[PDB]
Amino acid sequence: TSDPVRQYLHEIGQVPLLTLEEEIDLARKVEEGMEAIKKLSEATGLDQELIREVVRAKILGTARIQKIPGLKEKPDPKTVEEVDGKLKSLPKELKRYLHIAREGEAARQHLIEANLRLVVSIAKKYTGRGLSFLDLIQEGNQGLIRAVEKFEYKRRFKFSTYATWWIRQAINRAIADQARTIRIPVHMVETINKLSRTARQLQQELGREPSYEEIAEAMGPGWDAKRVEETLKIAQEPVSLETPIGDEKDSFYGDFIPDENLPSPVEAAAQSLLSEELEKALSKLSEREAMVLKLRKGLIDGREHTLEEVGAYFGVTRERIRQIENKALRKLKYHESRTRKLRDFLE
Amino acid sequence: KARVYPFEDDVEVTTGDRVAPGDVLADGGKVKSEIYGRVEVDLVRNVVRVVESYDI
DNA sequence: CTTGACAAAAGTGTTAAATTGTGCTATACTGGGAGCTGTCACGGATGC
Numbered sequence: 001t002s003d004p005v006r007q008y009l010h011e012i013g014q015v016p017l018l019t020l021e022e023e024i025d026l027a028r029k030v031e032e033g034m035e036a037i038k039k040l041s042e043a044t045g046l047d048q049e050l051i052r053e054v055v056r057a058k059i060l061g062t063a064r065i066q067k068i069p070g071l072k073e074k075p076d077p078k079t080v081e082e083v084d085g086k087l088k089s090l091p092k093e094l095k096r097y098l099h100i101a102r103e104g105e106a107a108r109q110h111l112i113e114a115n116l117r118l119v120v121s122i123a124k125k126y127t128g129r130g131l132s133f134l135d136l137i138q139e140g141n142q143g144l145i146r147a148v149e150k151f152e153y154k155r156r157f158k159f160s161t162y163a164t165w166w167i168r169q170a171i172n173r174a175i176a177d178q179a180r181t182i183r184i185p186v187h188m189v190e191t192i193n194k195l196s197r198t199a200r201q202l203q204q205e206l207g208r209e210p211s212y213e214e215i216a217e218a219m220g221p222g223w224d225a226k227r228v229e230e231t232l233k234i235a236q237e238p239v240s241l242e243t244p245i246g247d248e249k250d251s252f253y254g255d256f257i258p259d260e261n262l263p264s265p266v267e268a269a270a271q272s273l274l275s276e277e278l279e280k281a282l283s284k285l286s287e288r289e290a291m292v293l294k295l296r297k298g299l300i301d302g303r304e305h306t307l308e309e310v311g312a313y314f315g316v317t318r319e320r321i322r323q324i325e326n327k328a329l330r331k332l333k334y335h336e337s338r339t340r341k342l343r344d345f346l347e
Numbered sequence: 348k349a350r351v352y353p354f355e356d357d358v359e360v361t362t363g364d365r366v367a368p369g370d371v372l373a374d375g376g377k378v379k380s381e382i383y384g385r386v387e388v389d390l391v392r393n394v395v396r397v398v399e400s401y402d403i
Numbered sequence: 404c405t406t407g408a409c410a411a412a413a414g415t416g417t418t419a420a421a422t423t424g425t426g427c428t429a430t431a432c433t434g435g436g437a438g439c440t441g442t443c444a445c446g447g448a449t450g451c
Contacts, residue, residue, distance in 0.1 A: 010434080165429070187424090
């Protein structure tokens with residue numbers, strides 16, 4: 001039924017492997033291309049990666065590379081074409097390094113494709129992560145590219161080594177950057193791994209699972225029960241709301257979760273009643289002090305007013321405002337003990 | 348399957364351009380490859396050939 | 404409501420201590436993998 005994995009498998013199956021000869025030739029053609037770019041940088045006085053990408057623009061497709069980097073990366077007619085024209089002004093010795101360059105550029109692609117059959121075989125022991133087959137393999141191939149650009153054939157080492165070391169990394173990074181729904185930075189993943197590792201070891205030995213005492217003991221210095229327990233708490237991942245229930249296939253999870261982040265119908269009339277009855281009990285105070293109170297507690301502009309400010313527009317000193325709101329407060333305290341209307345709202 | 352067009356002084360074309368029946372190839376319009384296809388510039392063998400291809 | 408003196412609350416600048424992000428490891432490693440059955444009726448796209 002159109003398997004996505006067999007697609008890629010037979011797609012890499014079309015391009016054959018590479019023996020010693022082809023490999024060395026490839027790498028050499030690549031480094032030759034790159035150093036060619038290095039001289040071509042001195043040619044027109046440009047950068048490495050600049051001309052290097054300009055080469056790509058003419059090789060792995062023309063309009064398509066500059067068309068969808070996303071809405072803004074670099075202009076095609078402006079910062080690209082002028083680079084083509086500017087390097088067209090050069091003689092034999094110069095102009096040939098261009099062809100050398102692009103040749104090496106193709107050699108890089110051939111190299112990556114030839115060794116892809118490895119990267120696919122690398123992510124197979126790496127399954128069971130927070131990512132599936134293709135998702136893993138691709139992020140491994142991303143490591144294959146960097147494994148290519150940094151490789152040196154002069155060291156007489158088979159590329160299958162230097163590549164594999166970069167794949168084994170790229171995947172183990174790919175898990176650290178995806179994994180759990182919540183994002184966990186590298187170091188945390190590391191420490192967690194060490195913890196579970198220790199667990200697996202002393203549980204294999206002792207014939208039973210450890211305690212936060214012994215597991216942190218075996219973890220070395222600075223490791224106590226509280227810390228291992230802490231990182232253990234962070235270790236767990238969120239639970240899906242689509243989680244089924246018991247024997248009933250119909251029963252979901254999230255339908256059991258209440259909304260407390262929105263005011264309950266009772267709370268609406270509650271806050272209303274408070275804001276009303278308070279305004280009623282406020283009218284028994286002097287025109288100044290009553291205003292000063294709601295200016296102080298932010299029932300006016302929604303913000304607290306320092307004694308300095310309440311006194312600034314009233315002309316009175318801060319001390320005056322202070323005594324005013326104290327007095328007014330207790331003058332309210334007289335009526336409240338009587339009516340017992342607002343003696344509620346005590347939480 | 349292709350058609351060879353050896354050159355002498357440089358070229359106006361690069362590997363991966365397309366083609367046309369008698370368009371300038373190399374050496375100020377010395378040779379013109381007449382055919383449809385992909386163009387390959389070879390410094391070693393000092394030739395710029397074209398393998399027969401439509402640009403579909 | 405006022406004037407000055409002061410504790411505490413809250414500010415603001417520089418720094419020590421953590422937390423977080425990035426990179427590389429060159430003997431040679433070169434196409435995964437798990438399978439699951441005792442429906443049933445019908446309606447449409449597709450194949451003989």
